[PDB]
Amino acid sequence: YRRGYKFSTYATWWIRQAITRSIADQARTIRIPVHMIETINKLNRISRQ
DNA sequence: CTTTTTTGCCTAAAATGTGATCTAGATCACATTTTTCGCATCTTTTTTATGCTATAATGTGTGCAGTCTGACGCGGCG
């Protein structure tokens, strides 16, 4: 509490992390380590630009 | 009687046979230097498990079915 900010922001970071890599861990019959996942995100975004 | 063809001789001559006596060849079972191979180090080198980011954010549906149907079970349904 001492930071004096709204609590929502905090776990809005934490959860986001948890989700963001739990789907990447699971969610496939093929496991893909995170590094490929990241670079795939790079790819997909930059493709569109 | 003359020719030619043949053989045997002359006359020159190569091929055959003495075996006794060595002499460079090849064997022959077992020790040494080279290949470059295989598993332990390093030793990097890359890759991978794990860890944070402090404005703020508060109840789904999500795209579909086109609804077969006749008999029989079974829970109701009275």
Extract the tokens encoding A47: 């493709």
> Which nt sits closest to A15, CA to C1'?
B53
Angle among Cα A33, A12, A24 to the nearest 5 degrees reads 15
> Which nt sits closest to A2, CA to C1'?
B54
Extract the tokens encoding A25: 């861990």
CA A13, distance to chain mean position in Å, is: 10
Q: CB-based contacts with strand B under 7 Å?
A: A 3, 5-10, 12-14, 16-17, 33-36
Breaks (C-N over 2.5 A) in chain A follow: none
Nucleotides of B under 7 A from a protein CB: 47-50, 52-58
CA dist A6 to A15, A18, A19, Å?
16, 20, 21
Which residue do the tokens 């969610």 mark? A27
Phi/psi of residue A31, nearest 5 degrees? -75, 140
Q: Which method was used?
A: cryo-EM
CA A22, distance to chain mean position in Å, is: 8
Give this entry's resolution in angstroms: 4.3
Extract the tokens encoding A3: 């930071």
- Residue A25 contacts residue A31 (beta carbons within 8 Å): yes
